[PDB]
Design a protein around this nucleic acid. Structure first.
Ligand SMILES: [Mg+2]
Lengths: 121, 98, 117
DNA sequence: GAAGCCACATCCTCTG
DNA sequence: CAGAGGATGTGGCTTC
């Protein structure tokens, strides 16, 4: 199986998911041993390709993301100036400053894919 | 920084460069940061005397110095039998931030 | 080798020991298992997660899935977790879309591998 | 004070 | 053989 049977239950029960349900402190984890100038170019060049490596600093939980099924609603650099806007543990789930390489994000239970994925059983 | 309280190498080594009496085992080499190694096994022998490490020889002492490279404390004078030189421009960034 | 649970019951990995030295050849190389059929070729990277230094430095961090089992030639943990603290290391599986299994209380990374004090 | 650091100790290894 | 360097134990020293 790809997902758990009680897909909605786990997201709204598990301590892990509800801790990341709120808007938490996130930062760019890619190329930690590189100068601030290089890290700013790499991160932005990656976002446009549709991928990056962000972690919730508070909890520690790291992630490698993919903004796809180039894209519009997934990666948006116009919403604000100087910043830009998967199946985790068998649960279908869905900003960073362009100068500081830090900001705020969160998880949100995907009702769309949780029906599509559970139907494949 | 714990170079004050507990004895280092580069800290200990330069006890002997600046001291004219220990020119028997080492000396500065020229205006620029450089040093010779007169008696390579005696150099070690005293480092052993201090470190309470009687087994000590050059090969042992030496390695410790070959760490310094990656850290930007000192560097080698290529080809010269037992001649390295200090990176002071770094020691301060290694003893202070920027 | 010997396996252990994950937060995703679709994937399992090696028993990474309690407490180990900063950047050491691991005592048992890292085995990651795929119970759901994964195309033998998919990449699998890991990211060390902890409240302290949120993303620690790792070496041979990426591996290739082969016969439904991804083996990491020799993973090494450089960035330390701290006193008492251990990594909740993240496990990616590059697919469309990717899937992750988190792993709390994985390993304690200090400059010493636990000696006899 | 064990639990993390630290800066060498000891070691054997290649290769110019 | 000196010289750069991976591995791994060691002991003094700050930090919880
Ligand atoms: Mg070896």
């Amino acid at each position: 199986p790809r997902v758990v049977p009680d897909q909605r239950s786990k997201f709204e029960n598990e301590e892990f998911f509800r801790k990341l349900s709120r808007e938490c402190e996130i930062k760019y984890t890619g190329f930690r041993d590189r100068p601030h100038e290089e890290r700013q170019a790499r991160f932005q060049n990656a976002c446009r390709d549709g991928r990056s490596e962000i972690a919730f600093v508070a909890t520690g939980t790291n992630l490698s993301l993919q903004f796809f099924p180039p894209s519009r609603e997934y990666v948006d650099l116009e919403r604000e100036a100087g910043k830009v806007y998967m199946i985790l543990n068998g649960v279908c789930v869905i900003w960073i400053d362009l100068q500081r390489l830090d900001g705020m994000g969160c998880l949100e239970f995907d009702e769309e894919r949780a029906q599509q994925e559970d139907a494949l059983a | 920084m714990p170079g004050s309280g507990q004895i280092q190498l580069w800290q200990f080594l330069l006890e002997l460069l600046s001291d004219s009496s220990n020119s028997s085992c080492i000396t500065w080499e020229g205006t620029n940061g450089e040093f010779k190694m007169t008696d390579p096994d005696e150099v070690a022998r005293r480092w052993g005397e201090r470190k309470s490490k009687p087994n000590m020889n050059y090969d042992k002492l030496s390695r410790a110095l070959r760490y310094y490279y990656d850290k930007n404390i000192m560097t080698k004078v290529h080809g010269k039998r037992y001649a390295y030189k200090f990176d002071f421009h770094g020691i301060a960034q290694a003893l202070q931030p920027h | 080798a010997e396996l252990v649970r994950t937060d995703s019951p679709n994937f399992l990995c090696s028993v990474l020991p309690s407490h180990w030295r900063c950047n050491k050849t691991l005592p048992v190389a890292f085995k990651v298992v795929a119970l759901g059929e994964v195309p033998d070729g998919t990449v699998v990277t890991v990211m060390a997660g902890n409240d302290e230094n949120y993303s620690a430095e790792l070496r041979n961090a990426s591996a290739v899935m082969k016969n439904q089992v991804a083996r990491f030639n020799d993973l090494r943990f450089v960035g330390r977790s701290g006193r008492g603290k251990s990594f909740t290391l993240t496990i990616t599986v590059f697919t469309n879309p990717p899937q992750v299994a988190t792993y709390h209380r994985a390993i304690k990374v200090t400059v010493d591998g636990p000696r006899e004090p």
